Design brief:
The structure is a homohexamer. Helices cover 31% and strands 29% of the residues of chain A. Chain A contains five helices and eight strands, in the order ββαββαβαβαββα. The PDB classes it as structural protein.
Chain lengths: 202, 204, 203, 204, 202, 203
């Protein structure tokens, strides 16, 4: 009855990525991210986690057009694992029955024009990209996988700028600004991470 | 040409659900409604004109064109008025009531004794009444989405102490959130399942 | 890799549609290039291709939707817009007729609109408004970005009409036009002709 | 320390105004309400606790901190419950009912036979019921803003066929928009003026 | 009973400025702008104009925290004057009983930094300023006077960029981008226009 | 000409308040300069003064409100922030103590918050949430931008508390803090001390 699309431990949160919403996560804490179908089943999923481990906090809970999304976090890695396990047990699913990440698009725009940069910035928010910087774009599905890609990219290239991360919808989208080599190091690494993630076929 | 996804008379509106209702005139307790969902979405503009010009005494409460589908709610104090407006729509589009889709249940569950953290984040993604920690929560998902309308109204009739937390009747799927004692939410769920099964329509 | 769904030169913008058009605003008499692509995020490469090939053009729309990506660029010079488009075609390995052919989803003319219909209609809108008693033309098509040319062409052949609403983003495009029964009938007929004449692939 | 700007029992809610009502639980027709406006704005957080802990059976419908002032609405099916919660607020802040400001009328007028262009642009800056071309429109402005609440409810009692188009009860001034026949809107305006004059309070 | 704060014919609208809302004005048309107190009296003001001259259209109608605001427009200058006259007659006011414009602030920031430019752009909308351009800011009250200043500024320096115009509130605000001399020509001219406008004292 | 209402070095940002802070986001441990001025539009000159004097700082808040203008800038270097502030002072002909003295408008501690209060309270909010049974400290002051230092200082002396809401823009500032009755009492006392110690003019 409950199909799990994404089930992932994101360990050791980087500080930029830490920024529908509930309690906000902080740098160094750990997260469990779950995407499911049908969307409304996510309400049973969150009760399963919160009643097993009172010490974890909900950061995202949203019922989208098709899918249901959840993020929970804690300072203790042991606590998040245990919440993940209660979800798997209460729904009769396994971790490797999730969908495998499917890459939809990626590219590097070097030396973004100023007119491109200014319009980019106003239906993003949070961080911004400045004219002259290089831009990496990356699209995947299921959408919630954008989360782990963002965190890993920042990990290996800490000088980069997280411009935007869309984790909810039909597809996930990542925007990263920096020097041409920072964004190349990030792109190469993301591809590796996603290919190594185990799951079934769409 | 114009396909009817949902076509339903919702008779005798209960007071929580009436208040819960993109928006036009608000319906009131005891009044009657006609709900219609169609494809392609923009056809609903022909549907509302058909109704409003046949029976000038009905009032539009909802009119909206979504990503895929078109939605209309009309209501009146007179049950005969809503009925006749419904017939103008059917005749003017060459459709019949049983040309609609029969309800398909996607999910349902009863979460007892909701934790306080679940209740607090649940209450800020909803905007009407609120659920309190300790209450039991019923969630019910179906498609087409507009059937969520009749499910909410039937639940309140049969269990008037419940709390209508949210009713999502527009989109690819409808979602119902109901709070109360475990026996109130269990009585509502059983009735809803019966009501949706009794409805006549085509196959997805 | 980048699939082009809509690629169109829309030349000589009429003033109602021009203002209707987010980034820099176009003006009456200027020319625009409209592009809808799949997958959505590919549109960022598409706009980069245009702006550095022909710097004199300005972006008016840039948006990443649920499934698709949308771009509008414009300039006073028809040549600058055309040349920017060519850059987009070469850098994605496409040509203009590799786009999707326009598919008509629904159209209708509501004469003598009732007042209850008009007031609730005007509240899901924005800009111009329709008055009780006017006639309403509604027109739906896909891909959505084709709604742009339908709107601009309608205003060209019947400038007295009222542009109520134009939805160019999504799974489907929607056009709302108000005027006399004759203005909108002339508008509806011309829109169908324009759309049939556009060459593209299948669906 | 805590100054009361508005303190009022609104008895027996009429159905249009009840539905019209930052938001918490929705009130229903026939229920009773207590409305309070205070200064400084943040003091209202002490006021709601005072009420909710004295009489657990009342429900908050409105709680909001504005640019200058703080606002609360609580309601119940029991008139005695709203009354007693009101008294807890007065006792716990060292205030009395007549410490409030007496209503000051800023403007009123009756626009007959509204033009269609006025009606169409008027309807998109309002979000509830709508006014139709040809109807007469009453506008009424007062301060403090929260008195708009009692003015709307009194008008509907005395002229039930009217249309409540908008009620702005939060801010520096309250505004009331009412539609109907010229005699319905004239009957409402006369009554409102009497009601506001009869209210006891201090001087601006 | 009805106090008129601003009463002004803005003749021959420039194309940039032509962009709460009703029907949109077009380049070359003419407008009447009215601000009043108490705010709600603006509903009597608009009925007076629309019933006298059916051929004019409402573009702005809004009841703000303190004041009421109206804009109407037409292709015929004769029509707008006539609507203005119906308002004056129906409320027993005179055109020169409005408030005189009071200048609150103005300044020219030359060569705006790129970090300043990018953040400026996201809680504006419509047009944008690019890094390196010069910026003129101008504040006045009553707020509705920002309207005539914007239109006049564009008239004498058509190459300029109208970044934003706030006409509703306690004070009006104008943002203009261009070369340092375009913005200086605009600023000098605005000052002249406002000083020449006749009204009473606050 | 430019009147300074608030001018403050807020050094060593705590992590709840840091995230709470629109433009570039500050991080825990960095330093910020906060400025509230009158008239509102003067703030555009104020920020220009800072960013080109010390380019290494980043703007986090820039807003023109009904009456007043607000600016926040930040950097990892306390010296860069201080030096940017000095540029703001020289270019406007002010000094730090020409600002307004903080005026306390209301404060209170609600113990054992009822559940109906908590759920409706959480719906006019944003970020962190208060749970039924916790104690609530509310604190109101003017000018509003002083709410920033009150929030950051409270978190410094009682890091276990929950920052529910901080309103720094307007006619008045408002602080919402949740925790145990002891955390918030310690927080309330320290806030009053900090505010009394700030030197400025009258009101």
């Amino acid at each position: 009855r409950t199909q799990i699309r994404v089930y992932l431990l994101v360990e050791d949160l980087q500080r930029q990525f830490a920024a529908a919403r509930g309690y906000p996560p902080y740098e160094g804490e750990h997260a469990l991210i779950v995407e499911v179908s049908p969307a409304l089943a996510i309400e049973r999923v969150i009760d399963l986690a919160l009643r097993a481990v009172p010490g974890v906090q909900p950061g995202i809970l949203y019922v989208e057009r098709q899918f249901g999304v959840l993020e929970i976090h804690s300072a203790s890695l042991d606590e998040v694992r245990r919440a993940g396990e209660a979800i798997l047990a209460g729904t009769g699913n396994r971790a490797e029955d999730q969908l495998r990440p499917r890459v939809l698009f990626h590219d590097i725009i070097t030396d973004i024009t100023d007119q491109h940069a200014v319009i980019l910035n106003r239906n993003r928010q949070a961080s911004m990209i400045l004219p002259g910087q290089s831009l990496l774009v990356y699209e995947m599905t299921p959408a919630l996988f954008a989360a782990v890609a963002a965190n890993e990219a920042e990990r290996v290239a800490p000088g980069l700028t997280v411009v935007d991360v869309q984790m909810i919808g039909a597809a996930g989208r990542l925007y990263i600004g920096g020097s041409t080599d920072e964004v190349t190091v990030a792109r190469d690494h993301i591809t590796t991470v996603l290919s190594a993630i185990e799951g079934q076929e769409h």
